[PDB]
């Protein structure tokens, strides 16, 4: 059974950065795509990085294109979103979720809250 | 111009019978989109994979009271006998390359109620 544990959230102030994690198990993480998705308050579900099963390619929307990085340690079995000049706009749960063939999201971890306060 | 437009949120009595729409944009009338379900408090998550000829293949634990089918830029998720546990938002999302960049659309949502 697939588990995703996010980790590294909290309070935070806008201009600031943080760096969040998250714990797989259940599965062989460098057979996989990894991904972060964020819900912000609104509830509206908003995708934000991809990264390749040995970490060779990333993408992003232009959204956080210059400001969040994708990273994994597959010997860990930890995926990681590195956020920097953190925005009000940054507030939401983020999420990481994992693939599967075709689909995207086919797994999702439990979320880790982010608030910028300004 | 890629954008999903979703059915109004509405309330369904238990046994009932639910049929929610995605409607992608015009342009990408063919496109397969991905259904997602949030209860209450939890993680979203993946319903079923619904494409151009309504074709599908759902998630695990989706019972078979979820089915999809499509008309033209519509992409529709019926709920059979509406259970309690079926009290969630439902969200499709579309992927994309664009301009040899990955692009990913959610929709606004519909809340089902019961």
């Known amino acids: 059974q697939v588990q995703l544990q996010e980790s590294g959230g909290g309070l935070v102030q806008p201009g600031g950065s943080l760096k969040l994690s998250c714990a797989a198990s259940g599965f062989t993480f460098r057979d996989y795509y990894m991904y972060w998705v964020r819900q912000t308050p609104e509830k509206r579900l908003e995708w934000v990085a991809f990264i390749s099963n040995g970490g060779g390619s990333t993408y992003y929307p232009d959204t956080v294109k210059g400001r969040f990085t994708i990273s994994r340690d597959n010997a860990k079995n930890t995926l990681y979103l590195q956020m920097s000049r953190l925005k009000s706009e940054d507030t939401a749960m983020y999420y990481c979720?994992?693939?599967?063939?075709?689909?995207?999201?086919?797994?999702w971890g439990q979320g880790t809250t982010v608030t910028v306060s300004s | 111009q890629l954008v999903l437009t979703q059915s109004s949120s509405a309330s369904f009595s238990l046994g009932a019978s639910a049929k929610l729409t995605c409607t992608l944009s015009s342009q990408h009338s063919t496109y397969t989109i991905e259904w997602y379900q949030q209860q209450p408090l939890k993680p979203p998550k993946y319903v079923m994979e619904?494409?151009?000829?309504?074709?599908?293949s759902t998630g695990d634990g989706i019972p078979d009271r979820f089915s999809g089918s499509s008309s033209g830029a519509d992409r529709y998720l019926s709920i059979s006998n509406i259970q309690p546990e079926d009290e969630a938002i439902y969200i499709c999302?579309?992927?994309?390359?664009?301009?040899?960049?990955?692009?990913?659309?959610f929709g606004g949502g519909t809340k089902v109620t019961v």
């Open positions: 619904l494409k151009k000829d309504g074709s599908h």
């Open positions: 999302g579309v992927g994309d390359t664009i301009k040899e960049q990955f692009v990913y659309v």
């Open positions: 979720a994992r693939g599967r063939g075709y689909v995207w999201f086919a797994y």
